[PDB]
């Protein structure tokens, strides 16, 4: 439908822009962990990842509320829920990596949630492009 297609193309463009900020924040986060930075540093970078990814959750929320097509609503609500779940996972594992610092396993858990977030957000964007086509 016309209104859905226009909505999707528009928010695909916004998603692509926000994905840039997220990639920079995730990269910076990985670099912090790879140079063995302490909690005052990697906890800050965690917050940057969360804030920038939350922009994509919000796009999903906005899109899902206004899309007419059942399959569009379904897919975008899935990714909004999935990304929201992963953000809580990042808050949880970051706190645990700080509380147990220095712990290589705690840090790898945190790193894994952030990696999964990176993958899932890229996948969200891919699906928007597919829906818009």
């Amino acid at each position: 439908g016309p209104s859905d297609r226009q909505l999707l193309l528009f928010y695909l463009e916004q998603a692509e822009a926000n994905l840039t900020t997220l990639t920079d924040a995730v990269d910076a986060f990985f670099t912090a962990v790879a140079t063995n930075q302490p909690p005052k540093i990697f906890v800050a970078h965690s917050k940057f990842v969360i804030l920038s990814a939350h922009k994509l959750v919000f796009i999903g929320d906005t899109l899902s509320r206004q899309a007419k097509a059942a399959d569009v609503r379904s897919q975008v609500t899935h990714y909004s829920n999935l990304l929201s779940d992963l953000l809580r996972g990042i808050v949880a594992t970051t706190k645990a990596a700080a509380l147990q610092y220095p712990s290589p396993s705690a840090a790898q858990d945190m790193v894994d949630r952030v990696k999964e977030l990176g993958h899932s957000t890229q996948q969200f964007r891919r699906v928007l492009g597919q829906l818009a086509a």
């Binding site: 917050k47 953000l87 970051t94």
Partner: peptide, 12 residues
């Protein structure tokens, strides 16, 4: 979707 201010607050 959660409130962003609340997620950040829990790391602060």
């Amino acid at each position: 979707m959660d409130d962003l201010d609340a997620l950040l607050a829990d790391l602060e």
